[PDB]
Structure formats: structure tokens, C-alpha cells
Amino acid sequence: DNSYKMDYPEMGLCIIINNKNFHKSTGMTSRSGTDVDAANLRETFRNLKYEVRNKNDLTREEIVELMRDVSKEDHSKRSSFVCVLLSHGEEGIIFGTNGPVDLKKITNFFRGDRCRSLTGKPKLFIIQACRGTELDCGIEDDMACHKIPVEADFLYAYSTAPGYYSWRNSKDGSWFIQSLCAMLKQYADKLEFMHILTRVNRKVATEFESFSFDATFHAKKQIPCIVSMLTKELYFY
Amino acid sequence: DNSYKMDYPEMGLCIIINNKNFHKSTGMTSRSGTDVDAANLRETFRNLKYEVRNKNDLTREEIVELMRDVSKEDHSKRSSFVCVLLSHGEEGIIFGTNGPVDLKKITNFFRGDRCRSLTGKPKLFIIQACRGTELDCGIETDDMACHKIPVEADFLYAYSTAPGYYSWRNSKDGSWFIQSLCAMLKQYADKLEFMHILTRVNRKVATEFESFSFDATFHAKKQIPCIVSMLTKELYFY
Ligand SMILES: *[C@@]1(O)C2=NCC(C)(C)CN2c2ccc(S(=O)(=O)N3CCC[C@H]3COc3ccccc3)cc21
Ligand SMILES: *[C@@]1(O)C2=NCC(C)(C)CN2c2ccc(S(=O)(=O)N3CCC[C@H]3COc3ccccc3)cc21
């Protein structure tokens, strides 16, 4: 039909990978406020009736192993799958405590042909992480129904545009996760997911602007980036 | 508010760049069926009240100059902007008849800070082109609020295919993506929000198309388009 079947016995798993402290050997800074994000996400998705699992400070190999193991579970009774990544990043990559991991490597475990119990079901990846270091200064023969693509039914909700910084507040957490949780709490029971994320886009874009004693980091702006390979509308109610 | 203001005197420009024949120096083959796409789009957006401008076989230089020129027009009386790219490509790249153009280079002309008459208005880029050479084998079924906006805000990129992948085209019917896009626009433009129309495009391409080839390497392949939205509001064509 036009909407994903969301009345399975379980909504599904929500894995939250929260990397705050990084190996001294990498020289990466601590991510203050990420715990606020993790807590916020846990509550938001608990309310949406997901089975939330929080993990902290995982190495690159621990991330891969976790995803591999999770992709091997039986999701037959689950409507969907959600993974949230909170860490440093670059374009196409997220950081384990000890070094970079290609996002493709993580998401590949859930491909239509590699995780059969999630075939045809919405696979949501929410990524709070830099995608580079640019700063936004702002302005102002009938074969139907035989097969589906292995890349189909994924949604990648990026906190920021390709190549750009992603902003985070020590007190309130990241702009994106902050806004995402608020919009889900307010609209999960009346808007389709893409429309929810569009309001997150507007909230982040209009209501947030950096303030810094360092001119380089001051008055900066952010726009999130919705990437959908979904084939159906997604309602959480 | 919740929706873009789409009741300006004009809906806006729809630039269609249709690259079919390429310089021999590039070594790229003719794009059979692309003319079908270009005509389908012209008609589809004409019915949506867009001022359509078709361009054919432009060099990489001409594409840049065209985009620069268009971005320098006064879009004050126009609700939105649409650009359709039909060509060969690779990840992040679209081909002029005489070589590659970085997509960012093209879209940058329309950034919130560089095209003021489009600031706050939906800027739509529709890309029918390869994003790599991968094949999908498939599987059987304070208070600074509203002081400024991001410069990269209010763009939508409707890609024909997922990052890294081939995009499929039929010499008779045109590309899988453009076929489906025009069909869904024709049918749903007067009753669905744009993201929901594009989601039906996703489903149509994903379920109704599959390659047939005597060559095993190109046979039984599948495709999923890729919607990339930096939009801040819902978009309705009514
Ligand atoms: C981002 O996720 C990231 N990815 C990898 C790398 C190497 C670029 C490090 N990195 C990073 C560092 C810091 C942040 S942040 O959210 O703390 N934020 C983004 C812009 C810089 C920083 C805030 O800095 C200031 C400085 C002075 C006053 C206020 C804020 C995000 C990421
Ligand atoms: C794609 O846009 C593209 N980008 C650049 C480059 C150099 C890879 C050439 N290129 C390209 C060539 C052909 C197509 S297509 O739509 O004709 N299609 C996609 C997969 C190959 C081709 C169909 O191949 C066969 C072969 C045998 C039998 C049937 C079809 C797209 C692009």
C-alpha cells in the first residue's frame, strides 16, 4: 500500500551509539553534551515504543561487531529498525573511540539481501556527526513485485549538510538531536515521518545560531539533510 | 509557516539540460532515449505552470555560464526554481558534452547568499545520471530566531539513484526515474506534498523496473532513487 506496516508485535530496536571519550592516541576531543542527547533519544524512542539499547565509547571494531551481531538477530516480529550514531565524523564516516569507520560498512549489514528479517521494512539511521569542517555563515515485459533493490527502504537522517560542521551544546546537547526529539514528541501522532523531519529542518535552520568569543565560530548556522530511499510513508501511530 | 508560499505571480523557471551527444574526447556513448525524458518533463512542468527552458548538448563551460546567468536573474516574482539535469555522471559529478562538472559548482550559484531573489524559496535539482558504476542485484520479495537562515537551506536534490550506483535508461521509454517522476507528478501534483510524490516515485522505480540482458553482468538489476532534502517547509504545487 502507501504506508509501511507498523502494526507488528514490536516497533523494533533503537540502537544508540554514544561516543563521548576518545583514545588519547587519536587526539580527538571529548564530546560534551552528548549524554544529554543520548538520554533525550532514549526517552523519545521509549515513548514511541521502541526497544532502546544504549552503548557508550565503542572502538571502530566494536561498532562493526555490534552492528554485525544486531543484523543477525531475528527481526521478524519487528516493524522497523533504528540506529543512532553520536560521535565525531567526516563525510561518509563516523568515528569509533580509536579511529574512523565508513558509514557504508555499518549500514551494509542491513541491506535488503543481508538482513532478510528487515527486508521491506524501514531502516532508519540517525547521524549526529560532522560531515566535514565547513561552516555555514547564513544569510539575512512486466517484472513488477518480483524483486526490490538491496538499497531500498533506508532513511538516513543526517544532522547536517554534506561537508559541513554539526553543532552541539554542552548544556542542551546537539542542535539536531534536540530539535529531532522535540518534533517527534510533538508530532509523532499526527505527521508522516518526512514531514516531521522537515519541521526539524526548519527548527534547526531558524531557531539556532552559534554564539562564540571566537569570531570564527560565531553567528554560524546549520541545516540538516534528509536522505530517503524509503518506498512508503512512515507513521509512528 | 508550514508550507512554502507558492502563490507568487509565477511558479518559476524550469531549466532542462538535455545532454545526448558527447565529444569523442570524452569517450562516452550517446544517451539513447533522453529526448523522450526531456519532452516528458517539458510537458509535465508546463502543466505545473513553470516557464520551461530546454537546452541541448551543452559543454561543461556552457552549463556553468547558463547556471550563473540564470542565478543572476530577478526571481522576485517567482515562487520557486527547478533545474533538471539529464546526462552521464559519477558521484558528485555531472557531464557536459566535453567533460565533468562538479554538481556543487552548479548548485552554489543558487545559495541563499548568492541568489537573493530565491532566498527562502524552494530550489529543486532533479538529477538523472550515474553516481558510480555499482549495480543493485536486488532481493526477491537568547533569541536569534529567524535572524538568518543557512545558505544551504531550501535545496532539494532528487537523485535518480543511490550514491555510488548506475542509473538506468530505456532507449524507447526514457530513464526509469524520469518516466516515474513525470507519471507521479501528472497523477499526484494536485493532491500530494512533494516529498510524498517523490516517495511514490521511489516505490514505482523500485518495484516496476528490472533490467533484462543477454549479458549476465547487466541482467536482472534493480534501482532505488535517492531523495535529499534541505527543505524547511512542505511543498505543494496547487
Ligand atoms: C564534529 O562532530 C567533528 N567531526 C570530526 C572533527 C575532527 C572535525 C571534530 N569534530 C567536531 C568538533 C567539535 C564539534 S562541536 O559541536 O563542539 N562544535 C562545532 C563547531 C566547533 C564546536 C564548537 O566550538 C565552539 C568554540 C567556541 C565557542 C563555542 C563553540 C563538532 C564536531
Ligand atoms: C551513466 O549515466 C554513466 N555515467 C558515466 C559512465 C562513463 C559510467 C557512462 N554512463 C552510463 C552509460 C549507460 C547508462 S544506461 O542507462 O544506458 N545503462 C546503465 C547500465 C549500463 C546501461 C545499460 O546497459 C545494458 C547492457 C546490455 C543490455 C542492456 C542494457 C547510464 C550511464
DSSP symbols for chain B: --B----SSEEEEEEEEE-----TTTTPPP-TTHHHHHHHHHHHHHHTT-EEEEEES--HHHHHHHHHHHHTS--TTEEEEEEEEES-EETTEEEETTEEEEHHHHHHTTSTTT-GGGTTS-EEEEEES-SSSB-B--EE----TTS-B-TT-SEEEEESS-TTB---EETTTEEHHHHHHHHHHHHHTTTS-HHHHHHHHHHHHHHH-----SSGGGSS-B---EEEE--SSB----
Cell numbers at residue B155, please?
A: 535545496
* Residue nearest (by alpha carbon) to ligand 2 atom 18: B168
Least distant ligand from the CA of B161: 2
| A194 Cβ under 8 Å from any chain B Cβ | yes
The Cα–Cα gap between A13 and A125 comes to: 12
- B118 close to B111: Cβ distance less than 8 angstroms: no
Contact between A209 and B147 (Cβ < 8 Å): yes
| Span from the CA of A102 to the centroid of ligand 2 (angstroms) | 27
Provide Rg for chain B, Cα atoms: 18
Coil, strand, or helix at residue A81?
Answer: strand
Which grid cell sits at A8? 507488528
Q: How far is the CA of A125 from the centre of ligand 1 (A)?
A: 21
Contacts for A103 with CB less than 8 Å, ≥ 6 apart: A92, A93, A94, A125, A127
Q: Between chains, do A219 and B148 touch, taking CB under 8 Å as contact?
A: yes
User: What are the grid coordinates assigned to A37, written together?
Assistant: 542527547
**Residue A196 belongs to what H/E stretch?**
helix A193-207
Round to whole Å and give the CA distance between B78 and B8: 6
Resolution (A): 2.0
> Is the CB of B130 within 6 Å of ligand 2?
yes
Pairwise CB contact (< 8 Å): B230 & A223: yes
The residue among B165, B163, B157 whose CA lies nearest residue B228 is: B157
User: What structural domains does chain A harbor?
Assistant: 1-237 (3.40.50.1460)
CA atoms within 13 A on the CB side of A176: 26
Closest CA relative to residue B123, chosen from A160, A223, A136, A229: A223
CA distances B163 to A2, A49, B227, Å, are 25, 32, 11
A88 noted as active-site residue: yes
The catalytic residues of B are 88, 130
| B190, B238 Cβ separation under 8 angstroms | yes
SS3 content of chain A, % helix, strand, coil (to 5): 30, 25, 45
Nearest-5° Cα angle at B112, B105 to B230: 80
